[PDB]
Amino acid sequence: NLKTLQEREARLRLEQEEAELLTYTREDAYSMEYVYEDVDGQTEVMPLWTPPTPPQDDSDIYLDSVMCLMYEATPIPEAKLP
Amino acid sequence: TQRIASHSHVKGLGLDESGLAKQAASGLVGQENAREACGVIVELIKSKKMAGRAVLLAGPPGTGKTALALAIAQELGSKVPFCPMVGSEVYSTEIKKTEVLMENFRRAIGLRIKETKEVYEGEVTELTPCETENPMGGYGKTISHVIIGLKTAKGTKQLKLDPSIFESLQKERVEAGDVIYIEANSGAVKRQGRCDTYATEFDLEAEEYVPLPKGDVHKKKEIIQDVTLHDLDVANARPQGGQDILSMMGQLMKPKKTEITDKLRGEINKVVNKYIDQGIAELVPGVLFVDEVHMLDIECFTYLHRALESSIAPIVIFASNRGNCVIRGTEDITSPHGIPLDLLDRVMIIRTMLYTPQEMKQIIKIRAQTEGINISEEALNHLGEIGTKTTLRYSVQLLTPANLLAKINGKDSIEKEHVEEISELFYDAKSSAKI
Amino acid sequence: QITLENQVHQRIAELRKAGLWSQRRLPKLQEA
Amino acid sequence: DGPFAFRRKAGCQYYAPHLDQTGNWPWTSPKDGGLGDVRYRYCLTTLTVPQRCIGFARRRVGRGGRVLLDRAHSDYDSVFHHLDLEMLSSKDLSQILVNIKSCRWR
Amino acid sequence: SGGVYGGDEVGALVFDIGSYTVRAGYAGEDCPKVDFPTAIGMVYYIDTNALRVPRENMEAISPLKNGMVEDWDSFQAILDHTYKMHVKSEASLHPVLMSEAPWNTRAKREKLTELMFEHYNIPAFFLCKTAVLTAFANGRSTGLILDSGATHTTAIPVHDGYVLQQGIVKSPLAGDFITMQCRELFQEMNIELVPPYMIASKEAVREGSPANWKRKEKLPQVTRSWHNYMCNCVIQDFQASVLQVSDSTYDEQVAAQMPTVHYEFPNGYNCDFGAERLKIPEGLFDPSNVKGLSGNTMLGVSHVVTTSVGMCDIDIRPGLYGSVIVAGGNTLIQSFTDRLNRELSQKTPPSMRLKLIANNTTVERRFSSWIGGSILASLGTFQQMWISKQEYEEGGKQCVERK
Amino acid sequence: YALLYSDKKDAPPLLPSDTGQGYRTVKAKLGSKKVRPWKWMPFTNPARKDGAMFFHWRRAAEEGKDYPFARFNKTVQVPVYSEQEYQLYLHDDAWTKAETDHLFDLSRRFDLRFVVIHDRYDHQQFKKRSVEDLKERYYHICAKLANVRARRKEQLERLYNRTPEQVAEEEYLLQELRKIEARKKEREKRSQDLQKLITAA
Numbered sequence A: 001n002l003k004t005l006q007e008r009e010a011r012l013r014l015e016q017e018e019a020e021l022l023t024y025t026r027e028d029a030y031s032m033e034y035v036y037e038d039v040d041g042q043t044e045v046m047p048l049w050t051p052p053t054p055p056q057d058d059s060d061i062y063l064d065s066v067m068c069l070m071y072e073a074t075p076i077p078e079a080k081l082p
Numbered sequence B: 001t002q003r004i005a006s007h008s009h010v011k012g013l014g015l016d017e018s019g020l021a022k023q024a025a026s027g028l029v030g031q032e033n034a035r036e037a038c039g040v041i042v043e044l045i046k047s048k049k050m051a052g053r054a055v056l057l058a059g060p061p062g063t064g065k066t067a068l069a070l071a072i073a074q075e076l077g078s079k080v081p082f083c084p085m086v087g088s089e090v091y092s093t094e095i096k097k098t099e100v101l102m103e104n105f106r107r108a109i110g111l112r113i114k115e116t117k118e119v120y121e122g123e124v125t126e127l128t129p130c131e132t133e134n135p136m137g138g139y140g141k142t143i144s145h146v147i148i149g150l151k152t153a154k155g156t157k158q159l160k161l162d163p164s165i166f167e168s169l170q171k172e173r174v175e176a177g178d179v180i181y182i183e184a185n186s187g188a189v190k191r192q193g194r195c196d197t198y199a200t201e202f203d204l205e206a207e208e209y210v211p212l213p214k215g216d217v218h219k220k221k222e223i224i225q226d227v228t229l230h231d232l233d234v235a236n237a238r239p240q241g242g243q244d245i246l247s248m249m250g251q252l253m254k255p256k257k258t259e260i261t262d263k264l265r266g267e268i269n270k271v272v273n274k275y276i277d278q279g280i281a282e283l284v285p286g287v288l289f290v291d292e293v294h295m296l297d298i299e300c301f302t303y304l305h306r307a308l309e310s311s312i313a314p315i316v317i318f319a320s321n322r323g324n325c326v327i328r329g330t331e332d333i334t335s336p337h338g339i340p341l342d343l344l345d346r347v348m349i350i351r352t353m354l355y356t357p358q359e360m361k362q363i364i365k366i367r368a369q370t371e372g373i374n375i376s377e378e379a380l381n382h383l384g385e386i387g388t389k390t391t392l393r394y395s396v397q398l399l400t401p402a403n404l405l406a407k408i409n410g411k412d413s414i415e416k417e418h419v420e421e422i423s424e425l426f427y428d429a430k431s432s433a434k435i
Numbered sequence C: 001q002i003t004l005e006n007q008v009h010q011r012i013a014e015l016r017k018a019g020l021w022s023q024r025r026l027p028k029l030q031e032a
Numbered sequence D: 001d002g003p004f005a006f007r008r009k010a011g012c013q014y015y016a017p018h019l020d021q022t023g024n025w026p027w028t029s030p031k032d033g034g035l036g037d038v039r040y041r042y043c044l045t046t047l048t049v050p051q052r053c054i055g056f057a058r059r060r061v062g063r064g065g066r067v068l069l070d071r072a073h074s075d076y077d078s079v080f081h082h083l084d085l086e087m088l089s090s091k092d093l094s095q096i097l098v099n100i101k102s103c104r105w106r
Numbered sequence E: 001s002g003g004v005y006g007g008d009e010v011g012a013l014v015f016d017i018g019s020y021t022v023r024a025g026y027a028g029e030d031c032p033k034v035d036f037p038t039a040i041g042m043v044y045y046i047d048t049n050a051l052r053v054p055r056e057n058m059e060a061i062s063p064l065k066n067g068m069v070e071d072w073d074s075f076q077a078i079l080d081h082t083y084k085m086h087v088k089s090e091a092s093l094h095p096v097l098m099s100e101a102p103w104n105t106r107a108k109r110e111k112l113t114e115l116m117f118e119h120y121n122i123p124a125f126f127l128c129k130t131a132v133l134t135a136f137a138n139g140r141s142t143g144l145i146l147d148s149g150a151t152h153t154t155a156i157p158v159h160d161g162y163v164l165q166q167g168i169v170k171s172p173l174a175g176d177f178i179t180m181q182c183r184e185l186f187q188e189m190n191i192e193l194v195p196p197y198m199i200a201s202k203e204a205v206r207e208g209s210p211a212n213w214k215r216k217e218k219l220p221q222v223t224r225s226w227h228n229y230m231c232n233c234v235i236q237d238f239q240a241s242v243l244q245v246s247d248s249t250y251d252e253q254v255a256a257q258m259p260t261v262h263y264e265f266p267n268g269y270n271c272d273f274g275a276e277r278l279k280i281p282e283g284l285f286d287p288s289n290v291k292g293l294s295g296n297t298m299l300g301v302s303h304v305v306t307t308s309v310g311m312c313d314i315d316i317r318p319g320l321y322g323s324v325i326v327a328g329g330n331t332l333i334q335s336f337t338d339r340l341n342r343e344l345s346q347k348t349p350p351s352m353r354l355k356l357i358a359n360n361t362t363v364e365r366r367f368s369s370w371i372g373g374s375i376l377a378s379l380g381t382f383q384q385m386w387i388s389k390q391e392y393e394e395g396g397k398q399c400v401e402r403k
Numbered sequence F: 001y002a003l004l005y006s007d008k009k010d011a012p013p014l015l016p017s018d019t020g021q022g023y024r025t026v027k028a029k030l031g032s033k034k035v036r037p038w039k040w041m042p043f044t045n046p047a048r049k050d051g052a053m054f055f056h057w058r059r060a061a062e063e064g065k066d067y068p069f070a071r072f073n074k075t076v077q078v079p080v081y082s083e084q085e086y087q088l089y090l091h092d093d094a095w096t097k098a099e100t101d102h103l104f105d106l107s108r109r110f111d112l113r114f115v116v117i118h119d120r121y122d123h124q125q126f127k128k129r130s131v132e133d134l135k136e137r138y139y140h141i142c143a144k145l146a147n148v149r150a151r152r153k154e155q156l157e158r159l160y161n162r163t164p165e166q167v168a169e170e171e172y173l174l175q176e177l178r179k180i181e182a183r184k185k186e187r188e189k190r191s192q193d194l195q196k197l198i199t200a201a
């Protein structure tokens, strides 16, 4: 009986190593939205990764992210001298 | 519904960190020494070291004895029980006075009882893995284990329970697809009902379908129940379960509140101590505020100054309003505060002086604020003056009617004219004495 | 005092040879 | 100090560099990388019909208009399965320390 | 959310042509369904099966020399055979997204476009670089595409999706060198033999003892180049099976103490190489003491990458070091990626983030070019960059300004 | 520990798909509806700039809807000067008309990606130029055009200060870089000592 329990536990373990979950239940999750509340009770919306939206104007200035590896932003004050 | 009561502004003794008294003491004003004594006695209560101690809130009428009583009660908090009682309630036609007093004492004492139970639930998938017959005997067909496939909302978990429970499974209608309420130690099965997932809209039935359990199969439900000792007394007093108790004529007279000392003390106290020292409950002695104590009969004081001698008696806050008066039930036996001189020796007297006219004005203003009506300076001064003339409680009662008169007259704030008109429409007893 | 002063001196002397310095003194980028 | 000086300036704006911590593309964590865009953030979420926390995940739209829910692995992937007791309402405080209880409801 | 801006799939038969193996397949798919040797059995037979049947001559020739197609006839034959057999799709029915090396000449590019728009009449065409696709395969707009094909090793950098042509470093170190070194080692210790192409049957052989087998009486196959190719097949099998890359400076103290590994030749000859199986993959990173060319001056993998980074502007190097993209067949060798990472870390200047994309687990590195091509084709915004038949027939036929 | 940030994918993860199970449960749910016919129809994208036409999978109900992604073709704002405009305003000694035209063509083709421009710049037809030089020339031409038509001051000196210093830093030898790190640690220790001193006072 001990050997049977051991082999049954091993078999069950093998089953857990293939895939836990594989579906998303589109019935509600597909259209329903996600929201959470932090420790401070503040609300935030779940940002879903959508393809690039069509730009309707000249907004969305070029960012050049690869340049941000060493630079962050441009402050207002400067040295202000020749 | 806010339903503002007579005196709800009191929220606590409002004593500073050092224990002294201040004016804006969380609603209650004045009464420095009295509020300091209230703080000392509430610290005593919180200590929960002494029992059977009584305190007397002696003071002339209008000193806010009940006000400071409710203040100290709120300071204690809803955690510890607070049973308010008036001397008139002791007079009962069905139960003797001393037993009513003992029941009130029991109510004043609280007791939190915890209860943790490990229970397993979920949709069952019954299956018995065939096992060789008992190896100690011959051969045949036996069952060494019974696996139950409890499925919960979070997942599935099969339990290889003891085979002896198979009788319980067959006893109740435990079929594959219903929710069962398993118990760790007992093991008894209590089917909650089929899963709502199978509750087809065309099936007409109720109380048979229940939703799936949310969370892991193994749940350790921790529940705490706070019941006063009087609750346990009443519960153990009357019977339950068969015995032809369903009768109406000879049993409907439930008011058998009569109680004996053997059951009250003794076994109940012992089981309470067993639950305490075992970790199943925690004793919580409260307070018994007895206003109008002078209204009690001498047969009540003679039992009070004996119950206070017991180790289990809780803290009692007496509040006598009368002065030197003959004790009820006695033949012209005058005693201070209408209380026998023997009981006054066992109570700490907290004297409360009369409110200063400035304190009267403060009380009137804070009561107007609590009511939610603005009052002009002249109107407030007139209210304070009339409260100095007659009883103070008359002024506070002139706020709401004056407020309504103002609102009906087209103005918002209570002008001096409104209070002046109300003082002539309504007046006090001192002026009514002119018969 | 007896040694900290010399350390501060040799640090300030070896701080910036001709401007190149990883901690600070980095020409700021131009916008575009 | 040397020819390389910030003394030069004109009618324009200059971007300042960040020192002591070199950043990476927006798809890196701000703690380790820099300017970590939330679009590439994997956060704990709870499904609708199931009552188990699948761990860190992020909503993403796929080909054909179908929305997918990527996932990640960390903290053995087991502590989060038990974290449902903290979102529905050591292995008990760890669920409260590893996260700020920012699990997505519904 | 309808996802109107998701993507589009319009034909786009990606054809990633490679020196060791050509790849092909429809766009939108994740793995190319077509993968066969590139060399044709020119007497034309180009197939994993047709290229293994004995006939009169069957001379093996690779149309792409140095990654550059030169024999247009053999290239056209390969394309036609591939289409007809594997795809069964009419030429002028679906566009094509063939790939090219970063060093494709203008004249050769124009000739390829002409061959595409004249003999096949495909509805559209677009010729993207191999490094660009390899970068898109990993979702990277900037990085070092360390190609390690069978004939060249090049750390091509890309900037915002555009290849830096001046940063490429065409190092001769490649699979061909490893195969030649393995052939030399074999000839030194034993005699290299043809695969079962000629071996009728094998027998049990004691480890290290001479093998015995029966010779087939089929055609002699006087063409030695075909014999050279059949031997290179087994050489590459050996390379991918047992050959392992060192993890340190390769001192002659640890290799003699590592575990032993076995390998069986086509004739059954069993031999162990646990002592020097890691000697051959050394010139790749340290081409300083290779027995073949002892007086050579080459740059290892890490050296090639560092040079490719330095030859480009510094403003992009932060995005190049941090996004090294390893690709090509040589990389699948055991401990290759780890050795490369170690060498780059010890060589790269500190304070600059160095991250190796975790993609060595699978063999998809070879197909990275085709994956990137299929990805690019599946895009909607890219649907306008295709060189349509109208742009060509108009008279321009200029792929330089359009690509 | 903290939440994870990853672009593509981690080592062991896995994503769930949509549900198509319980056909019996949803039998009548989807049996009471039909499918909108999808047709392999031809579509013409207006951004093609030519008469070519391709195919795409769309429903027969929207045979129109020329192309959704067509509105993404936003060309960069690059002035287009004439020959006389160059002769009058943009005339230069080191530069020439053909070189400026080539620079502007590369800029329009690569969308103001001066790095890729310099990379693909024809160093044969025109002598070697630097990235900062191309940027200065382009910005000067744009400013002159915007002025004569009637944005911010460009300083080539700044780029002359940033790139060489950053290169010299990137070329820090191992020993000198370790020495610089040691000097940084020593300066941090001095700062801590100064903090301790000011706190003790």
Ligand SMILES: Nc1ncnc2c1ncn2[C@@H]1O[C@H](COP(=O)(O)OP(=O)(O)O)[C@@H](O)[C@H]1O
Pocket (backbone or CB within 6 Å): B006, B007, B008, B009, B027, B028, B029, B030, B031, B060, B061, B062, B063, B064, B065, B066, B067, B068, B321, B362, B363, B366, B367, B393, B396
């Ligand atoms: N210090 C105080 N501050 C504010 N209100 C008070 C104060 N003392 C008494 N009152 C008011 O007096 C009224 C009743 O007082 P109470 O406690 O009944 O005294 P007694 O019972 O002696 O008449 C209450 O409505 C309360 O508003």
Ligand SMILES: Nc1ncnc2c1ncn2[C@@H]1O[C@H](COP(=O)(O)OP(=O)(O)O)[C@@H](O)[C@H]1O
Pocket (backbone or CB within 6 Å): E017, E018, E019, E020, E021, E064, E066, E067, E130, E147, E148, E149, E150, E151, E175, E236, E237, E239, E240, E328, E329, E330, E331, E332, E333, E366, E367
């Ligand atoms: N000209 C080329 N351009 C790009 N990739 C190439 C080129 N020539 C060969 N390759 C790639 O290099 C690989 C060489 O294979 P090889 O390294 O011998 O396989 P392995 O080492 O895994 O046994 C091929 O898979 C091929 O995809």
